[PDB]
Design a protein around this ligand. Structure first.
Ligand SMILES: *[C@@H]1O[C@H](CO)[C@@H](O[C@@H]2O[C@H](CO)[C@@H](O[C@@H]3O[C@H](CO[C@H]4O[C@H](CO[C@H]5O[C@H](CO)[C@@H](O)[C@H](O)[C@@H]5O)[C@@H](O)[C@H](O[C@H]5O[C@H](CO)[C@@H](O)[C@H](O[C@H]6O[C@H](CO)[C@@H](O)[C@H](O)[C@@H]6O)[C@@H]5O)[C@@H]4O)[C@@H](O)[C@H](O[C@H]4O[C@H](CO)[C@@H](O)[C@H](O)[C@@H]4O[C@H]4O[C@H](CO)[C@@H](O)[C@H](O)[C@@H]4O[C@H]4O[C@H](CO)[C@@H](O)[C@H](O)[C@@H]4O)[C@@H]3O)[C@H](O)[C@H]2NC(C)=O)[C@H](O)[C@H]1NC(C)=O
Ligand SMILES: *[C@@H]1O[C@H](CO)[C@@H](O[C@@H]2O[C@H](CO)[C@@H](O)[C@H](O)[C@H]2NC(C)=O)[C@H](O)[C@H]1NC(C)=O
Ligand SMILES: *[C@@H]1O[C@H](CO)[C@@H](O[C@@H]2O[C@H](CO)[C@@H](O)[C@H](O)[C@H]2NC(C)=O)[C@H](O)[C@H]1NC(C)=O
Ligand SMILES: *[C@@H]1O[C@H](CO)[C@@H](O[C@@H]2O[C@H](CO)[C@@H](O)[C@H](O)[C@H]2NC(C)=O)[C@H](O)[C@H]1NC(C)=O
Length: 483
C-alpha cells in the first residue's frame, strides 16, 4: 500500500516559532514488516520530486534495500523544491533558510517527529526503529553530512557519488571524463579546447568572430560565453550508464573523429588532428546540439535562438525567473553561491592537460552569482559576505569526515565526474579512502554517476552487481544489529 502526505516542517530549526511550512512526501509499505520495522528514507535532492515515484520500488536501490530488511520506504521532497517551498519567490532574502544546516535538521526532525499514516504509534519513528538514509549525488552528500553533523538519529547511511568536499575551482569535474574517454577523442577535444583559448587570448577580432561562426554562434557577444558551450561535449558523459548503450556521449566522440556510427575504418590513438577535429566539433554543435537548446528553457521559442548563452544580460529570464519551478534550478545555484559549495566546472590549471577551455574559469561562474541573486532588502549570498569552501569543510569535515564514521557505506564510480570531490577522489590527501570493515567503500569499475541506484545497471553490468550485492549485504547485517 502507498500514499502521499504532507509534513509541517520547521522553517528555522534554531528558531522553531518563526513557524512551519508544508513539505511533500510519499511512502510505500509494500515490504514493510509492521511496527518497529526499518524505514528507508530518500530525497531526490536538488530537484522537484515529481516523477521520482520509482524510488519507492525495487527497481531502484532504495526499494531493494527495503525488500531485504522488510522496511517501508519514504521519499521526501527537499525544501524549496516542487511543492515544498516556504516562499513562492526566491531571492536573496527568502532564500536565507535554504541552508545545508537546515536541510540536515530537516531529515532528523522528520524521522523523529512525523506522524505516519501507516503507524500512528511512535513505534516506527527513528527513536524506536532503525532508519536508513540513502542518497546519491547531492542527496548522498546530504546523507553523509548528516552522519557527520547530526549523528544520532538515523541508524545507518549509504552515500553514493557524494561530493562531500566543497571545491571552488573544480576543474577536476572533467578529469574522470578524460580518463574514461577514448584516447583519440581525448587528445582531439584537448586540441580544440586549447585552440579556443589561443584565439580568445592572442587572437584578432576577425579570428574570434570566424571561430564563433563555425558553431553557428556568431551572435554571441562575449567570447567567454562562447567558450562555455564546448563542455556540452564532455558534459554528456554524466548521462551515461551501463544501460545507455551507444549513447549521446559516444555519438559526440564519433562526430569528432569524423566517422559514422558503424564505421569500418576509424582513427588510431592519436586522432584526426586540429584542423579536422575543429570542424567536426563545430559541425556537431551547430547540427545536433544548438537547435532548440534555448527553447528548452521555455523562455524563448526560436529554434535557432542563441540567447540562453548570454550570461552577461542581467535581465535575462534565466536570472529574473524567481518562481519555484524556474528552469535553471536557481535553488541549486543558491547552494553554490551561498553555502558556498561552488563546484565551479572549469578548465585545468596551466601545468595540466584539459578537455575544456581554460577561459571557462571559476571567475566566469562566480561573476554570475549577483545576477542570479541581486542584493535584496539588505541580504546577499554568503560568498559575497566573505564565506568560501573552507566555511563548509570546516563544519562538515569534508573529505576528512571519514576519520570517525559509524555504519556509513560509500560507493563511487571510477569515471564519475563527481568522483574527485568525493571520498574516493585521487586528489584527496592520501588518495582514495581505503575500505575498512567499520567504514566500507567500493568503486564501480568503469562507473559513471550513481551507477548503482538503477537496477537496470544491476543486470546490465556484472561490476555493479558485485557492488550492489555487497552493500545490500552490509545494510542488512547492520540493521540486524538493531535487534
Ligand atoms: C578512436 O576513435 C573511434 C571512433 O570514435 C573510437 O571508437 C568508438 O569507441 C567507442 C568506445 O569504445 C564505441 O562505443 C561503444 O559502442 C558499443 C557498441 O558498438 C556497436 O555499435 C557502435 C555504434 O554503431 C551503430 O551504428 C549503426 C547505427 O544505426 C548500427 O550499426 C548500430 O546502432 C551500431 O550500434 C559501432 O560503432 C560498433 O562498431 C563495432 O563493430 C563494427 C562491425 O560491426 C566495427 O566496424 C567497429 O569498428 C570499431 O572498432 C574496431 C575494433 O573492434 C576497429 O577496428 C574499428 O576501426 C572501429 O574502431 C566496432 O568494432 C558496434 O557495431 C557499445 O556497446 C559501448 O557501450 C557500452 O559501454 C559503455 C561504457 O561503459 C556503456 O555506456 C554502454 O551502456 C555499453 O555498456 C554495455 O556494454 C559494455 C561492453 O563493454 C559492458 O561493459 C556494459 O556492462 C554494458 O553491457 C550490457 O549491454 C550490452 C549491450 O549494449 C550487452 O552486450 C552486455 O551483455 C550487457 O547486457 C560503446 O557505446 C564506439 O562504437 C566506437 N565507434 C566506432 C565508429 O567504432 C575508438 O575507441 C578510438 N580508439 C582509440 C584507441 O582511442
Ligand atoms: C520486486 O518486487 C516485486 C513486488 O513489487 C516482486 O514481485 C512479486 O514476487 C512475489 C514472489 O515471486 C510474487 O508472489 C508477487 O505476486 C510479485 N508481485 C508482483 C506485483 O508481481 C519481485 O519479485 C521483486 N523483484 C526481485 C528481483 O526480488
Ligand atoms: C565518533 O563519533 C560519534 C558520534 O559523534 C561519537 O559518539 C558520541 O560519544 C560521546 C562521548 O562518549 C557521547 O556523549 C555521545 O552521546 C555519542 N554520540 C553518538 C551519536 O554516539 C564517538 O565517540 C566518536 N568516536 C571516536 C573514536 O571519536
Ligand atoms: C536581455 O533579456 C531581456 C529579457 O529577455 C531582453 O528584453 C526583451 O527583448 C525582446 C527582443 O529582443 C523583446 O521582444 C521583449 O519585450 C524584451 N523583454 C524585456 C523584459 O526586456 C533584452 O533584449 C536582453 N538584452 C540583450 C542585450 O539582449
Amino acid at each position: 500500500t502507498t500514499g502521499e502526505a504532507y509534513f509541517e516542517q520547521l522553517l528555522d530549526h534554531h528558531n522553531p516559532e518563526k513557524g512551519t511550512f508544508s513539505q511533500r512526501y510519499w511512502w510505500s509499505t509494500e515490504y514493510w514488516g509492521g511496527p518497529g520495522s526499518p524505514v528507508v528514507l530518500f530525497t531526490p535532492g536538488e530537484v522537484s520530486a515529481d516523477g521520482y515515484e520509482g524510488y519507492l520500488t525495487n527497481e531502484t536501490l532504495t526499494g531493494v534495500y527495503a525488500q531485504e530488511i522488510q522496511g517501508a520506504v519514504i521519499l521526501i521532497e527537499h525544501r524549496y523544491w516542487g511543492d515544498s517551498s516556504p516562499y513562492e519567490v526566491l531571492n536573496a532574502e527568502t532564500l536565507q533558510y535554504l541552508t545545508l544546516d537546515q536541510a540536515i535538521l530537516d531529515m532528523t526532525y522528520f524521522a523523529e517527529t512525523v506522524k505516519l499514516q501507516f503507524d500512528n504509534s511512535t513505534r516506527s519513528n527513528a527513536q524506536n526503529a532503525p532508519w536508513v538514509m540513502v542518497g546519491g549525488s547531492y542527496s548522498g552528500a546530504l546523507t553523509a553530512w548528516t552522519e557527520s553533523v547530526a549523528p544520532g538519529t538515523f541508524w545507518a547511511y549509504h552515500a553514493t557519488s557524494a561530493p562531500v568536499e566543497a571545491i571552488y575551482d573544480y576543474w577536476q569535474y572533467f578529469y574522470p571524463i578524460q580518463q574514461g574517454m577514448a584516447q583519440n577523442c581525448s587528445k582531439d577535444v584537448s586540441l580544440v579546447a586549447e585552440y579556443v583559448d589561443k584565439i580568445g587570448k592572442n587572437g584578432t577580432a576577425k579570428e574570434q568572430q570566424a571561430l564563433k561562426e563555425l558553431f553557428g554562434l556568431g551572435a554571441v557577444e562575449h567570447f567567454d560565453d562562447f567558450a562555455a558551450v564546448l563542455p556540452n561535449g564532455p558534459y554528456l558523459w554524466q548521462d551515461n550508464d551501463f544501460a545507455t548503450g551507444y549513447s549521446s556521449f559516444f555519438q559526440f566522440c564519433d562526430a569528432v573523429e569524423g566517422v559514422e556510427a558503424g564505421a569500418a575504418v576509424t582513427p588510431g590513438p592519436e586522432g584526426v588532428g586540429l584542423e579536422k577535429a575543429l570542424a567536426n566539433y563545430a559541425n556537431w554543435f551547430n547540427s545536433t546540439i544548438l537547435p532548440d537548446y534555448c527553447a528548452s528553457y521555455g523562455y524563448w521559442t526560436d529554434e535557432w535562438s542563441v540567447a540562453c548563452f548570454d550570461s552577461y544580460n542581467a535581465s535575462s529570464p534565466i536570472y529574473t525567473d524567481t518562481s519555484v519551478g524556474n528552469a535553471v534550478d536557481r535553488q541549486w545555484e543558491w547552494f553554490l553561491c551561498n553555502e558556498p559549495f561552488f563546484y565551479w566546472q572549469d578548465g585545468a590549471p596551466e601545468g595540466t592537460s584539459t578537455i575544456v577551455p581554460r577561459l571557462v574559469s571559476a571567475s566566469y561562474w562566480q561573476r554570475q552569482c549577483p545576477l542570479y541573486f541581486p542584493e535584496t532588502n539588505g541580504y546577499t549570498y554568503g560568498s559575497a559576505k566573505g564565506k568560501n569552501a573552507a566555511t563548509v569543510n570546516s563544519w562538515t569535515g569534508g573529505w576528512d569526515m571519514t576519520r570517525n564514521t559509524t555504519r556509513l557505506i560509500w560507493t563511487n564510480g571510477q569515471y564519475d565526474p563527481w568522483r574527485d570531490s568525493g571520498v574516493s577522489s585521487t586528489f584527496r590527501p592520501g588518495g582514495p579512502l581505503a575500505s575498512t570493515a567499520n567504514e566500507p567503500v567500493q568503486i564501480i569499475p568503469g562507473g559513471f554517476h550513481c551507477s548503482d541506484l538503477y537496477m537496470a545497471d544491476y543486470y546490465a553490468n556484472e561490476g555493479v552487481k558485485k557492488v550492489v550485492d555487497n552493500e545490500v549485504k552490509q545494510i542488512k547485517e547492520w540493521v540486524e544489529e538493531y535487534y
